[PDB]
Design a protein around this ligand. Structure first.
Ligand SMILES: C[C@@H](NC(=O)c1c(N)nn2cccnc12)c1cc2cccc(C#Cc3cnn(C)c3)c2c(=O)n1-c1ccccc1
Length: 832
């Protein structure tokens, strides 16, 4: 049908890539995946409740933390209901449900309760203590305001109708680069499984000309019958240095042995998740290529010391290497290992995947999954089984099975790095992709962030754009017409605003200070865009509950920075919004904001870890979406400046520094002395939290220009673009603490206490943090050495040490900060 053709046009515009484009492929795996994803999409579409789906209540099953219980000593909670511009307060027990509040509301004086100024609803049979909006109002000491609205028409989510024993041999023909010190170049063929090179052959070294020819059969030691599914033929081009790489799945999505002629366009090197992609470089014009031929196809006692050695192995951290003896022990006593869910990553990383019968034994082992299936959900282990070291279908399938039991709250907590983990899938259609599709189609918020996460990569990396676009298209074909409309207008808005950001950046030279003519130009462009081209309103991508409307063109500016970010402020389209404050958005080009996304998501995961132990470090992981190559959006935190400007105002701008300035700023920006006390408390907590987080992630040695503070004392690092010091604990922070280099005021003692507590809390989830850090590096960083870079978070988390030594370690970090002072801060200016 032609309507379906226009609809595919629409989907392509939304995705930023055409999934029907068969130009850059050597098989039909992407199409097979588009076709296979139809079943789960339609299943979840038929299974989801229209009412709850449309109202998407953001709830949780976690208990209410201790610090938020300290805010409801009355066992009562006030809710301010607005029938129609007439507000009345109702007392509610934390256990009262939305329906209960209705049956009592009409007994104090069908419908639905919505959050004022937001597309959020308090619906469904959940104790209203478990509504995220209520927990937020409690955390920030705010009243819970609600509009009595009608249930959003469930019909608005309408969904359109869907419509043998032979050694493996590979002939290397040659390499061709259309245009390119010749030196020497050779080709290396690696049969790999999960980054584990099962075998390896090479060619002879030849001078590198724009065309090099071998026509040589490379025979590998592996028999064809031994090739495991998901095995990659990894072709690399060296010259000591690795110049090019590319990959081909030896077994396809049909269990068929790959066979025939292949001319693969390769990726150039500027370890790394990009080195695993099966996609070929779509730039057939400039990129190197290689020609290959495949002609080969149907798919009871245990001593004490040994059990102790085995448990020692099992107990070590995820980054602890496994000796050959360790692997042989794990494998010989594999049925004992199966009783310990934590031994699973190490047990399966001890499988000889290059042997067919060993893999069959491993599968028979996976059949004994009683202990694994009846074990509590350990996210660290699931992540470990989903990373780069596991290419087997069933191994990863068990991790996805464990993920299945997660609630939408935790799925949002881990969605970014699950999407990223999709990069470790050998095949486009995988249990992980299907699970992300399911959980996005089941919940509108998860689907919103899934759209934006998939699109951040689709429009930025050719390595995985095709796969992510297949998945995003599968999702869009089931999210519903309302969400398609929202996504369309969101994309249009962000594209206009990125146009403006780049066009303004062009108008300025290296000299930072922007001209007056450029202020005129920005005002002109914004007013021109506001009249007609800019839609009436749009959902804030990083906060899907907010609808932004008209531009406050008088408040829009551009920073006098090397990069020219745009500071835009919108009005809230929701007339029932309880305030008049503007929605702040920073549109920035020049930084890779995928790294910012990842660091922020790890920060949120750490906050949840701390909540599990009744701690609240008041971190502020502002919204942040990467929309394209070194371009994205950032949430504008209200009433926040930078420590740098707080120094510049009073101490001058010649690298000078004074210590009392922070406290004077907090007291002059504090209306009441009591609110200043509250601001100092918030400062201590947030500073401890950010010190701990920034040391754990190895990003603590920042410049005070990249550290901000709110007028209400809340501190927070920003711009994670990319003599040292473990973290930023400068003397101006200490003078707010109440210490003069040597003293130890009650607030500094509280700060040290909170630091040690949070640090040990993180050490409790050591494994999960290690795996998340490893995945973040592998999927979001430029280039990382597996040995050096990753193994920072082991020492940072002081692996293997008892809690006493870890406390002493973090306290000595604090003492290093105390000892150095402004050394690094001043050195930043010095090295101009
Ligand atoms: C500090 C910096 N970023 C934030 O403030 C911020 C926030 N509010 N949330 N958030 C969340 C994550 C990361 N960053 C943030 C910031 C960005 C910026 C982005 C675009 C345009 C402009 C501007 C301007 C301007 C024009 N004429 N004149 C006099 C000033 C700016 C700007 O001025 N500053 C800034 C610098 C020092 C002191 C105070 C403000």
């Amino acid at each position: 049908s032609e309507e379906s053709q226009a609809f595919q046009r629409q989907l392509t515009a939304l995705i930023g890539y055409d999934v029907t484009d068969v130009s850059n492929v050597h098989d039909d795996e992407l199409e097979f995946t588009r076709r296979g994803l139809v079943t789960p999409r339609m299943a979840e579409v038929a299974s989801r409740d229209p009412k709850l789906y449309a109202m998407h209540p953001w709830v949780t099953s976690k208990p209410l933390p201790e610090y938020l219980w300290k805010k409801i000593a009355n066992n009562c909670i006030f809710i301010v209901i607005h029938r129609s511009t007439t507000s009345q307060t109702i007392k509610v027990s934390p256990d009262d449900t939305p329906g209960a509040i209705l049956q009592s509301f009409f007994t104090k004086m069908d419908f639905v309760l919505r959050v004022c100024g937001r597309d959020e609803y308090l619906v469904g049979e959940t104790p209203i203590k478990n509504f995220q909006w209520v927990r937020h109002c409690l955390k920030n000491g705010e009243e819970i305001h609600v509009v009595l609205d009608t249930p959003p028409d469930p019909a608005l989510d309408e969904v359109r109708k869907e419509e043998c024993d032979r050694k493996f041999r590979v002939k290397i023909r040659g390499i061709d680069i259309p245009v390119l010190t010749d030196l020497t170049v050779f080709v290396e063929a690696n049969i790999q499984h999960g980054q584990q090179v099962l075998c390896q052959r090479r060619t002879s070294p030849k001078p590198f000309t724009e065309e090099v020819l071998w026509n040589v059969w490379l025979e590998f030691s592996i028999k064809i019958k031994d090739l495991p599914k998901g095995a990659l033929l990894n072709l690399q081009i060296y010259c000591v240095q690795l110049l090019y790489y590319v990959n081909l799945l030896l077994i396809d999505h049909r269990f068929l042995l790959r066979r025939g002629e292949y001319v693969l366009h390769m990726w150039q090197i500027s370890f790394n998740a990009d080195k695993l992609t099966s996609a070929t470089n779509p730039d057939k014009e400039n990129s190197m290529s290689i020609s290959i031929l495949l002609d080969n196809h149907p798919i009871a006692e245990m001593p004490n010391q040994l059990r102790k050695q085995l448990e020692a192995i099992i107990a070590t951290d995820p980054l602890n290497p496994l000796t050959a003896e360790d692997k042989e022990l794990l494998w010989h006593f594999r049925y004992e290992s199966l009783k310990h869910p934590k031994a699973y990553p190490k047990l399966f990383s001890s499988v000889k995947w290059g042997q067919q019968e060993i893999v069959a034994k491993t599968y028979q082992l996976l059949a004994r999954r009683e202990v694994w299936d009846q074990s509590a959900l350990d996210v660290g282990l699931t992540m470990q089984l989903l990373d780069c070291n596991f290419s087997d279908e069933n191994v990863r399938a068990i991790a996805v099975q464990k993920l299945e039991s997660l609630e939408d709250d935790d799925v949002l907590h881990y969605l970014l790095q699950l999407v990223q983990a999709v990069k470790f899938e050998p095949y486009h259609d995988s249990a992980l992709a299907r699970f992300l599709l399911k959980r996005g189609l089941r919940n509108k918020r998860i689907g919103h962030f899934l759209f934006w996460f998939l699109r951040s990569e689709i429009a930025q990396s050719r390595h995985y754009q095709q796969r992510f676009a297949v998945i995003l298209e599968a999702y869009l074909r089931g999210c519903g017409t309302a969400m398609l409309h929202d996504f369309t207008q969101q994309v249009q808005v962000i594209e206009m605003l990125q146009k403006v950001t780049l066009d303004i950046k062009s108008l300025s030279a290296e000299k930072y200070d922007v001209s007056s003519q450029v202020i005129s130009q920005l005002k002109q462009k914004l007013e021109n865009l506001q009249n007609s081209q800019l839609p009436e309103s749009f959902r804030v991508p990083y906060d899907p509950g907010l609808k932004a409307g008209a531009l406050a063109i008088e408040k829009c500016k551009v920073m006098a920075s090397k990069k020219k970010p745009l500071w835009l402020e919108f009005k809230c389209a929701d007339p029932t919004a309880l305030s008049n404050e503007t929605i702040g958005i920073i549109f920035k080009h020049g930084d890779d904001l995928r790294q910012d996304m990842l660091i922020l998501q790890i920060l949120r995961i750490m906050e949840s870890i701390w909540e599990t132990e009744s701690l609240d470090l008041c971190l502020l992981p502002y919204g942040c979406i990467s929309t394209g190559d070194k371009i994205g959006m950032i949430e504008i935190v209200k009433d926040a400046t930078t420590i740098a400007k707080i120094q510049q105002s009073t101490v001058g701008n010649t690298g000078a520094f004074k210590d009392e300035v922070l406290n004077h700023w907090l007291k002059e920006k504090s209306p009441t002395e009591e609110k200043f006390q509250a601001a100092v408390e918030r400062f201590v907590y947030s500073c401890a939290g950010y010190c701990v987080a920034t040391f754990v992630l190895g990003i603590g040695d920042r410049h005070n220009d990249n550290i901000m503070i709110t007028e209400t004392g809340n501190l927070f690092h920003i711009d994670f673009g990319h003599e040292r010091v473990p973290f930023v604990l400068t003397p101006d922070f200490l003078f707010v603490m109440g210490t003069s280099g040597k003293k130890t005021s009650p607030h500094f003692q509280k700060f040290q206490d909170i630091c040690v507590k949070a640090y040990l809390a993180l050490r409790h989830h050591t494994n999960l943090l290690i795996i998340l850090f490893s995945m973040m590096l592998m999927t979001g960083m430029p280039q990382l050495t597996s040995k050096e870079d990753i193994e920072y978070i082991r020492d940072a988390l002081t692996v293997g040490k008892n809690e006493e030594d870890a406390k002493k370690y973090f306290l000595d970090q604090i003492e290093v900060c105390r000892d150095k002072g402004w050394t690094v801060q001043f050195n930043w200016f010095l090295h101009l």
